[PDB]
């Protein structure tokens, strides 16, 4: 059903576009100045703030870039927003930029200070997908969250409490949690946790376990390709009428859109442009915890690790100066594309006999034992954990698609026998 899903999300994309265009028309920015991921960001945040203000706005004068510090009627912003969405709220829309920010933050920064202070191992990076993502995020906003993300929450919710309506949260927060797991025990052990009203260190210690189980027996976490407002604004302005032509966040749509985007970015004096583009590109698909090998494969070019990356962050701090500041054109094109997945990969009182109702060749079942016959769920997992090898192939048969292959017709299988450059962005 490509009607609602493909076109309703198109309508949410149109809103962001239209709005970005309106908002650019207010600031009286130029074309080059509306394509500046910097300014786009500021605008996006102005809005999410107002629906839950001012910001840094960079201008282009003969030669050099001028930063303007401006403020807007928090309500005016809310007004212009609905105007674009037909006077609707389009929470989806705000939530969308709510993620674009997330996915950018999960790649620009490493959130160790918080994991440890929670009592999670800093090496649990690949499980903190969407830790920055405000709770206000929607229902399809949390689905993007990593297993580890959920744990940091409950643990704090629990840690301060164990140190009214708050209950329905906890159970649900676990149900979601549990819905991340895709194996018997995993699933069952989550329940054993959700049993305690005042879950103390008993739970505190157990979920942390399950956190680590996901490092091996991963869960289902959705990835959403959420591009900057400018990209959608520019697209809308170019005629693309997504609600009519359909759009996706996990298909070929987002890559294709980025195949023509003209996004520019402010770049500090000693920073590497190629390195800058990489960053943004990884935020456009939630590839901050992906295997660098595959990221580079699909990317088309080296996807260098965070440490070796030359850049501190895309936003410009009030500290810096404009004199020594210039801007480059971000390389967001990719070689192939791939279905952004959700899956993490993987490798009595009852009846005892069957009463036959039809005449067919059928082995008739009965439980030989029970008839003639007259522990720690951790263990289960630890035992599963074990048989697991890092070489264990996932998404068997799934491949990569050419950018011409609009339909999911012909898949391509990558062979990594190659002089790679690592697998852990962090």
Numbering used by the authors: 21 to 72, 92 to 202, 213 to 396, 402 to 428, 438 to 489
Task: Reproduce the article's own wording on this structure.
The three-dimensional reconstruction obtained by imposing 9-fold symmetry lacked information about the polymerase complex but could achieve better resolution for the NP ring. We also carried out a docking of the atomic structure of the NP in the cryo-EM reconstruction. The handedness of the cryo-EM map was determined on the basis of the correlation coefficient of the NP atomic structure docked into the symmetrised volume. A good fit is observed between the two domains described in the atomic structure and the volume of the NP monomer. However, additional masses are observed at the top and at the bottom of each NP monomer. We propose that the extra mass at the top of the NP monomer corresponds to the protein sequences not solved in the crystal structure while that at the bottom may contain genomic RNA. The interaction among NP monomers is conserved in the NP docking presented here, with the only need to alter the angle between NP monomers from about 120° in the crystal to 40° in the RNP volume. This interaction interface would be more realistic, as no NP trimeric structure has been described in natural virus RNPs, and would imply a small change in the arrangement of the connections between the loop and the body of the NP (positions 428–438 and 396–402). The model obtained is compatible with the interaction mode proposed earlier and further indicated that additional side-by-side interactions are now possible due to the tighter packing of the monomers (black arrow). The relevance of the 420–428 loop in the NP-NP interaction was verified functionally: The contacts of amino acid R416 and F412 are essential for replication, while amino acid K422 does not appear to be important, in spite of being conserved among type A and B viruses.
